[PDB]
Amino acid sequence: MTHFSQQDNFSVAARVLGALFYYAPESAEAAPLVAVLTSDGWETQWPLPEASLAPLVTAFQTQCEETHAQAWQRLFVGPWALPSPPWGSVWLDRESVLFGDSTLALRQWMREKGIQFEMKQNEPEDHFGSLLLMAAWLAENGRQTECEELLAWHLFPWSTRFLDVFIEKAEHPFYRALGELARLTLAQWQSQLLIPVAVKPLFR
Ligand SMILES: [Cl-]
Ligand SMILES: [Cl-]
Ligand SMILES: [Cl-]
């Protein structure tokens, strides 16, 4: 009878994933979490079976010529095209623009729920990382229904496709393993929804 968002380390997992997608690995926000995932022990706390996490433990700790900072810059910043853009409207808007039609639906939904959760200046609300941070924060506030709506309606319709391509093209053991951790985790949560996941055609 307890909602999935209020148990099994939901908000901790959502925050760790959200922060590592949204913040550079050498930042104050993400560095402590890179430390955690590159250390032994995390797999015993993560809300997924240890046997499933075993290959990810090794991968997070694989040394690599390219630094975490360089990989994150390349995957999430630039200067070149991102291998798997982390904003929903790229996948959901027929034209794949930022601040697209799905981004407005998200904004309208947040306004409707009285949600104020502001992130980077000039950036859209539908970044994968900030959606997980917002959902984590909603869960911490006990707002299980809105947490579930956010996931069902504004993240899950496109997040599987984004992670598929992200994992395929990550090209760094740490971010590949991160994508895989996120894919397993989000799929677990999706299986626990009490409302139907939204279903949308994808354009990338
Ligand atoms: Cl490290
Ligand atoms: Cl629009
Ligand atoms: Cl509620």
From Swiss-Prot:
Q: Which UniProt keywords apply?
A: Cell inner membrane, Cell membrane, Chaperone, Cytoplasm, Membrane
Listed under GO biological process in this entry are:
chaperone-mediated protein folding; protein maturation
In its UniProt record, a GO molecular function of this protein is: signal sequence binding
Q: Does the keyword Transferase apply?
A: no
**Localization:** Cell inner membrane; Cytoplasm
Domain of life, per lineage: Bacteria
Matches recorded under Gene3D superfamilies: TorD-like (1.10.3480.10)
* GO cellular component annotations of the record: cytoplasm; plasma membrane
Q: Does the keyword Nucleotide-binding apply?
A: no
Instruction: Return any one Pfam family short name.
Output: Nitrate_red_del
What's the protein's topology in the membrane? Peripheral membrane protein
Q: Which cysteines share a disulfide bond?
A: none
Family listed: Belongs to the TorD/DmsD family. DmsD subfamily.
Provide the function of this protein.
Required for biogenesis/assembly of DMSO reductase, but not for the interaction of the DmsA signal peptide with the Tat system. May be part of a chaperone cascade complex that facilitates a folding-maturation pathway for the substrate protein.
- Full protein name: Tat proofreading chaperone DmsD
Task: Write down the species.
Answer: Escherichia coli (strain K12)
